Amino acid sequence: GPKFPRVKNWELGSITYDTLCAQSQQDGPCTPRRCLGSLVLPPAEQLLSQARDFINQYYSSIKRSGSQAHEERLQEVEAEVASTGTYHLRESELVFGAKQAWRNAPRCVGRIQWGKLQVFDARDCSSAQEMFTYICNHIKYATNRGNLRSAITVFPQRAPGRGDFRIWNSQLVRYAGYRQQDGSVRGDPANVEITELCIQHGWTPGNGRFDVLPLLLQAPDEAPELFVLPPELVLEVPLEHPTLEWFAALGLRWYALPAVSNMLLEIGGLEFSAAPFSGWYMSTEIGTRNLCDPHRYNILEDVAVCMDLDTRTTSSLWKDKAAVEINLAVLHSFQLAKVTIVDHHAATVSFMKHLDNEQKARGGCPADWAWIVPPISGSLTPVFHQEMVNYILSPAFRYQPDPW
Amino acid sequence: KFPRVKNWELGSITYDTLCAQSQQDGPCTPRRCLGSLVLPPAEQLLSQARDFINQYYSSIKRSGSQAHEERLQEVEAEVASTGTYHLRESELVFGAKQAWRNAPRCVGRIQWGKLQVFDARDCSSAQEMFTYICNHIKYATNRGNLRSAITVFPQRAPGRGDFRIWNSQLVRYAGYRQQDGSVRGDPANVEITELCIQHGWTPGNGRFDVLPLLLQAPDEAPELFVLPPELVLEVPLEHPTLEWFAALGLRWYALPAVSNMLLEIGGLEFSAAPFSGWYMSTEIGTRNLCDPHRYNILEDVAVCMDLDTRTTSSLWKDKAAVEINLAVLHSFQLAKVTIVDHHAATVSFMKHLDNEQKARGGCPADWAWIVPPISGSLTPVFHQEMVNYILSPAFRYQPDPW
Ligand code: HEM
Ligand code: HEM
Ligand SMILES: Cc1cc(N)nc(CCCCCO[C@H]2CNC[C@H]2Cc2cc(C)cc(N)n2)c1
Ligand SMILES: Cc1cc(N)nc(CCCCCO[C@H]2CNC[C@H]2Cc2cc(C)cc(N)n2)c1
Ligand SMILES: C[C@H](O)[C@H](O)[C@H]1CNc2nc(N)[nH]c(=O)c2N1
Ligand SMILES: C[C@H](O)[C@H](O)[C@H]1CNc2nc(N)[nH]c(=O)c2N1
Ligand SMILES: [Zn+2]
Numbered sequence A: 001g002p003k004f005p006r007v008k009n010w011e012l013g014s015i016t017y018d019t020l021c022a023q024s025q026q027d028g029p030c031t032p033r034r035c036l037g038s039l040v041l042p043p044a045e046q047l048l049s050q051a052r053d054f055i056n057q058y059y060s061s062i063k064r065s066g067s068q069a070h071e072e073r074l075q076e077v078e079a080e081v082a083s084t085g086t087y088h089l090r091e092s093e094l095v096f097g098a099k100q101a102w103r104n105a106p107r108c109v110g111r112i113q114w115g116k117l118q119v120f121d122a123r124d125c126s127s128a129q130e131m132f133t134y135i136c137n138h139i140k141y142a143t144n145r146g147n148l149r150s151a152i153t154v155f156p157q158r159a160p161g162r163g164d165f166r167i168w169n170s171q172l173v174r175y176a177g178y179r180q181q182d183g184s185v186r187g188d189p190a191n192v193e194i195t196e197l198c199i200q201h202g203w204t205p206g207n208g209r210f211d212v213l214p215l216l217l218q219a220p221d222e223a224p225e226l227f228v229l230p231p232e233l234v235l236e237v238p239l240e241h242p243t244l245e246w247f248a249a250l251g252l253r254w255y256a257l258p259a260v261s262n263m264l265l266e267i268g269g270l271e272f273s274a275a276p277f278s279g280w281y282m283s284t285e286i287g288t289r290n291l292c293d294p295h296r297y298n299i300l301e302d303v304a305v306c307m308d309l310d311t312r313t314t315s316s317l318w319k320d321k322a323a324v325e326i327n328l329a330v331l332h333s334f335q336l337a338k339v340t341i342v343d344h345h346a347a348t349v350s351f352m353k354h355l356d357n358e359q360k361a362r363g364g365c366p367a368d369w370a371w372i373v374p375p376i377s378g379s380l381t382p383v384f385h386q387e388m389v390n391y392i393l394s395p396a397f398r399y400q401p402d403p404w
Numbered sequence B: 001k002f003p004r005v006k007n008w009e010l011g012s013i014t015y016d017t018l019c020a021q022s023q024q025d026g027p028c029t030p031r032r033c034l035g036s037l038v039l040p041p042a043e044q045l046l047s048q049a050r051d052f053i054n055q056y057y058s059s060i061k062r063s064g065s066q067a068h069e070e071r072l073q074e075v076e077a078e079v080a081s082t083g084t085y086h087l088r089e090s091e092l093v094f095g096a097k098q099a100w101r102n103a104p105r106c107v108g109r110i111q112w113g114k115l116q117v118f119d120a121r122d123c124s125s126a127q128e129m130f131t132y133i134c135n136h137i138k139y140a141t142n143r144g145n146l147r148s149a150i151t152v153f154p155q156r157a158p159g160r161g162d163f164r165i166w167n168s169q170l171v172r173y174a175g176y177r178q179q180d181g182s183v184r185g186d187p188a189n190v191e192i193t194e195l196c197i198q199h200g201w202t203p204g205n206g207r208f209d210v211l212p213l214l215l216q217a218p219d220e221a222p223e224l225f226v227l228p229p230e231l232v233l234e235v236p237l238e239h240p241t242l243e244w245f246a247a248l249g250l251r252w253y254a255l256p257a258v259s260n261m262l263l264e265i266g267g268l269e270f271s272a273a274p275f276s277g278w279y280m281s282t283e284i285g286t287r288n289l290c291d292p293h294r295y296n297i298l299e300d301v302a303v304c305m306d307l308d309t310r311t312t313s314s315l316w317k318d319k320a321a322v323e324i325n326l327a328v329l330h331s332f333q334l335a336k337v338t339i340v341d342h343h344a345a346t347v348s349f350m351k352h353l354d355n356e357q358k359a360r361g362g363c364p365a366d367w368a369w370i371v372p373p374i375s376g377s378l379t380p381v382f383h384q385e386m387v388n389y390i391l392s393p394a395f396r397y398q399p400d401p402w
Helices: A045-061 A070-084 A091-104 A128-146 A187-199 A243-251 A283-292 A300-306 A318-337 A344-362 B043-059 B065-082 B089-103 B126-144 B188-196 B281-290 B298-304 B315-333 B341-359
Strands: A006-009 A016-018 A118-121 A151-155 A177-179 A185-187 A215-218 A225-227 A236-238 A254-257 A264-267 A271-272 A396-398 B004-006 B013-015 B117-120 B149-152 B174-176 B183-185 B213-216 B222-223 B234-236 B251-253 B262-265 B267-269 B392-394
Touching: A070 B392, A091 A118, A091 A236, A091 A264, A091 A396, A118 A128, A118 B341, A128 A151, A128 A215, A177 A187, A177 A396, A177 B089, A177 B298, A187 A215, A225 B013, A236 A318, A254 A283, A283 A318, A283 B174, A300 A318, A318 B315, A396 B315, B043 B065, B043 B089, B089 B149, B089 B262, B089 B392, B117 B126, B126 B213, B126 B222, B174 B188, B188 B213, B251 B281, B281 B315, B298 B315, B315 B392
Parallel strands: A118 A151, B117 B149
Antiparallel strands: A006 A016, A177 A185, A215 A225, A236 A254, A264 A271, A264 A396, B004 B013, B174 B183, B213 B222, B234 B251, B262 B267, B262 B392
């Protein structure tokens, strides 16, 4: 074959060549000498070239590449950058850019859905209070009484010598994590720092395991302001198991809406520092990671004890048995509650379909194997057996430093 | 810059400095990561040779000695006259252990210093190869108390064909392709099965027929050798509580022994150098029995358990897999054959990472291979960042001989 990465599926014996990776402008963490794939954490004329590239992507997406409108838009952008140092996206350009950022996200297994994204344009927002209103609207629309809908809300872009719009919280919904006197944590240990930041900024803390955090919202060059979500806007699912009656007695729950709020959306050189987006959960994110990680709720031993498993020897597979029942409880409870959720089998089958769609549409799909393969039952899903090429395309969602 | 390597469960950071010692490239470039891929003159030989001799004398703390200097002259003298050289037995022993230590895909490396090395470099015929292989199997098997071992046959030489073992492992079950494309037995072994028959083997018709070995002395047709049934220890599979499981008629062999890899030491290449340890239960329970392109028994077990097969959200697949793994562990424990579960194995690997950090300043590891195929995030290795790179001595893939 050709001189592009050859990609193999070991289950089916089929081969593809990734030619899309040629479009990658930005380097990842690896070199010839060493693979750094498993690592969680990897303008002037510079703006113009990123902007030109994005405008070319837009016009090609609407099959008007080389058109008069295409060439006029290019001239517009360079003139605007020439005089002001920056430029602004048309509305349809933002919608295209946000969908493309999602389509481009190598860590997202949900990308079959990429073309179905509600884009709320909030580039008119001028205060923290209005951010909150926009966010509540997002949450209401996206939650939709359990019939979840993917959405993103985009706040004003970064601007030269003016402060950023930032949502301080890592997600729109987060449970408090309260550091105890003994040094243990009540609630979610992932959220200890954001919890202590909320208190420093005047929040009156609770002391439950599932206290919903307020939002800390920052408008340009202002201290962040604190906003409590009205509890009726935050849909949650109490967890029960279909046959283990005691599981409901554990008082476990999770919220419906996974909504990432700390990522930067980059489109044609422009940087949207506040641009929260939401989808629906894959069940392993809740049942395996959030509930069973040792550094999260860590409930495995408790569930195993209730199941009367032999927790004293690794070889009884007590961890695997408990984890499976916890995942089942998550699925069953969301289903009973009528809240959209997808299991890791159905999600990974749909990601394989996505890989085939993108092979034909673009000649490849950037994908992070370690993130795509679910954290339980890996080789039981078709993605385990699929080789993947990881690279950065733009538009992109990127990590950005915390605002404090 | 040297890689920062973080453990996300403990918050601890190390820096890998061992990777600087890498000379051969992996598949990745700055543009794109290819880490998930399964398949990625005299002065050149001389520099690899010297570097390996330096590794050796350093390992015995005699670096810079008379012995060291003289050995470097011997190697130099032999390469300059003949284009090649030969290893002393003790250097071979050191290189074999180092190749294993360096194997990025191996979760069992806490064991690396405990390897029995059989020198089979005085082998001159397929007949002799078979004798050496039977001794390896008998030693390694040890009536169920498994012992890691490697047997090293003669190195590649410029003027001739290679010594090769055609089979990918020393023990493999036949796969018989049916007229309608389906397979009886192990679908992974269809090609070696046909090669065996074609070289004269009378085939069986079972799901677990142990294959003969095809052994090749240089520039000769391979020869067929049936392993004596008493040499191949096997474990019938049953479940501690599910009575019908035994009725599935399942079984696996005790001894995992890879026989198709090339061992490279100091620039010299050992095209036949089979090595063996003991199994991690997920290799059998998860991959060999449940891969859809392997024995693919998930659905049969699910039905036997009376699971709801009609929907993925019942997690029938996850439930059947767990019980299959449990049966493997139980059965091996019952038969007194060494096995390690994925929790104990990954915990030991974490200890190995820490040992290697102190000893060498790093450890090459291939995350996708180290994390087990079920319950990944339930093991500590899932949460550990890892740097993959090629050090020498090394085990490598090589082309199939046919
Ligand atoms: C439609 C339902 C969706 C499902 C089932 C889904 C599934 C997932 C899963 C399972 C992860 C890994 C999360 C983890 O390990 O914590 C993920 C990560 C990601 N997803 Fe999707 N997703 C969906 C919608 C979306 C939407 C609407 C966007 C953006 C528009 C998106 C962009 C991302 C990004 C950027 C990451 C990486 C997060 C990070 O690095 O912190 N996802 N998603
Ligand atoms: C002591 C018992 C051992 C255990 C439990 C162990 C564990 C493993 C496991 C689980 C794999 C991945 C296998 C797969 O996914 O198919 C592996 C691969 C490997 N192991 Fe170890 N191992 C052990 C001994 C050894 C020994 C003695 C050597 C060499 C002297 C070795 C070298 C390798 C190599 C080269 C691979 C990669 C094989 C390939 O790429 O096909 N292992 N081992
Ligand atoms: C939109 C959406 C859908 C869906 N099903 N799931 C999600 C949740 C993704 C949340 C990912 C959280 O990532 C954190 C916690 N684990 C790894 C770490 C990676 C990371 C680091 C940083 C600095 C930021 C960030 N967003 N993500 C989001
Ligand atoms: C020593 C040892 C211990 C232990 N627990 N397990 C083993 C067996 C390792 C089996 C390796 C099988 O690898 C093949 C089949 N799946 C991935 C593929 C990788 C590969 C490709 C090629 C060309 C050769 C090769 N040896 N391995 C060996
Ligand atoms: C060290 C390792 O990269 C890390 O634990 C990764 C592995 N795979 C993952 N996969 C997903 N989806 N999410 C994660 O947070 C992680 N964590
Ligand atoms: C495509 C992907 O890399 C491939 O399926 C790998 C994943 N991880 C693995 N890990 C181990 N131990 N053995 C394997 O064969 C594989 N296969
Ligand atoms: Zn890489």
